[PDB]
Design a protein around this ligand. Structure first.
Ligand code: CL
Ligand code: CL
Ligand code: CL
Ligand code: CL
Ligand code: CL
Lengths: 112, 112
């Protein structure tokens, strides 16, 4: 959670921190997966981050995106309080719990 | 005041921020210049920082170091309130207002 310090010759010091560009395709609710892919799909996370920890980041981003329009989600049958503390799963294109270029976000594990 | 973003191939992103290791030799008050060189002489500053802005950083570090012992500085004739808003000068080994490996901190400009 802190950058790496690299020292060179003439007392010059650079701090380097690594990240990976993660784009999330949402499979939470088919009727709003489109707007979730537009408004809260781009993420930049440290290489050392755990997927179970990155889950809470995407989770808060989902609720923070949907809270201003919660009253429009009630006629769709979506209760944010149910979503606000539900379990969020992320996995790579092959259904593995590893960070990757493209990932899926679903309420259910990646099938088999 | 923000790091530089560098993108590589497989969606890997690194943030790089540069600094220079500055060690200050104090010429403020001969009787306490020793302890100032021991307790608040090491600094790490961005390459783009201005010296007049780095002056306020060293200034607050001086007062923050001396405030717990202000009552010991009164018999020495040092008033921190006078120091707390005095003018601080920094210059390189050749008396230039440029950041360098080694710098001097004095209440007076670098002579000629
Ligand atoms: Cl409502
Ligand atoms: Cl990947
Ligand atoms: Cl950084
Ligand atoms: Cl006193
Ligand atoms: Cl230098």
């Amino acid at each position: 959670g802190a950058p790496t310090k690299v020292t060179f010759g003439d007392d010059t010091v650079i701090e380097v921190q690594g990240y990976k560009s993660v784009n999330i395709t949402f499979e939470l609710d088919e009727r709003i997966d489109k707007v979730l892919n537009e408004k809260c799909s781009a993420y930049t996370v440290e290489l050392g981050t755990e997927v179970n920890e990155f889950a809470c980041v995407v989770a808060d981003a989902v609720i923070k995106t949907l809270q201003p329009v919660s009253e429009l989600l009630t006629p769709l049958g979506i209760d944010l309080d149910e979503w606000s503390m539900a379990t969020y799963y992320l996995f790579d294109e092959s259904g593995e719990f590893k960070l990757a270029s493209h990932m899926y976000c679903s309420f259910y594990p990646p099938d088999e």
